[PDB]
């Protein structure tokens, strides 16, 4: 674990994280995708052999000796409200399953369900509060990373309000 185990927030490109692991925001497919997808397949692709997995789970593959997690969060498009809330808070309780298997003591996370999945809609707290119900008992040091500079003010305020 890390020795005081931490939230931390950067605005920058998760393909350039400096965590012993990364959460990919994958497609049930495997498929290269878009947004965070693209970029960790450009950085990761070998990661990618036999990633597919359903909704609301998180597989991991390894590229090289380095952890891809990927979690499928729903697509808010073809969930209902209801449903896409609880496939999304499960995908990130596998998160915390996978990080907590694999013995990182860091890790960076992208907000699962916010890019072309959120339905056209704003979900940086209803992701972030995902994220933190399933991570606040690991003791990985956990960096989220975004590419807003709103995005960035409200995830490092929601951080420092809980300290
Ligand atoms: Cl990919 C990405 C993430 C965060 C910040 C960025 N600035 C230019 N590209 C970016
Ligand atoms: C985070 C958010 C959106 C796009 C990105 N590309 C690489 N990292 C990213
Ligand atoms: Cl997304």
């Avoid at 597989?59 to 498009?77: Q, R």
Wanted: hydrophobic share 35%.
């Amino acid at each position: 674990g890390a020795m005081a185990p931490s939230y931390r927030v950067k605005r920058m490109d998760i393909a350039k994280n400096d965590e012993e692991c990364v959460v990919n925001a994958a497609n049930p497919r495997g498929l290269p995708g878009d947004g965070v997808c693209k970029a960790v397949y450009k950085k990761w692709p070998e990661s990618f052999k036999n990633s597919a997995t359903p909704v609301g789970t998180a597989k991991t593959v390894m590229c090289g000796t380095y952890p891809v997690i990927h979690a499928v969060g729903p697509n808010f498009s073809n969930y209902t409200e209801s449903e896409g809330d609880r496939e999304l808070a499960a995908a990130y309780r596998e998160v915390a399953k996978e990080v907590t298997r694999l013995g990182v003591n860091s890790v960076a996370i992208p907000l699962l369900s916010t890019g072309v999945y959120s339905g056209g809609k704003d979900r940086l707290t209803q992701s972030l509060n995902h994220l933190f119900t399933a991570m606040d008992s690991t003791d990985a040091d956990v960096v989220i990373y975004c590419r807003d500079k709103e995005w960035e003010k409200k995830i490092s305020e929601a951080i420092q309000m809980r300290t």
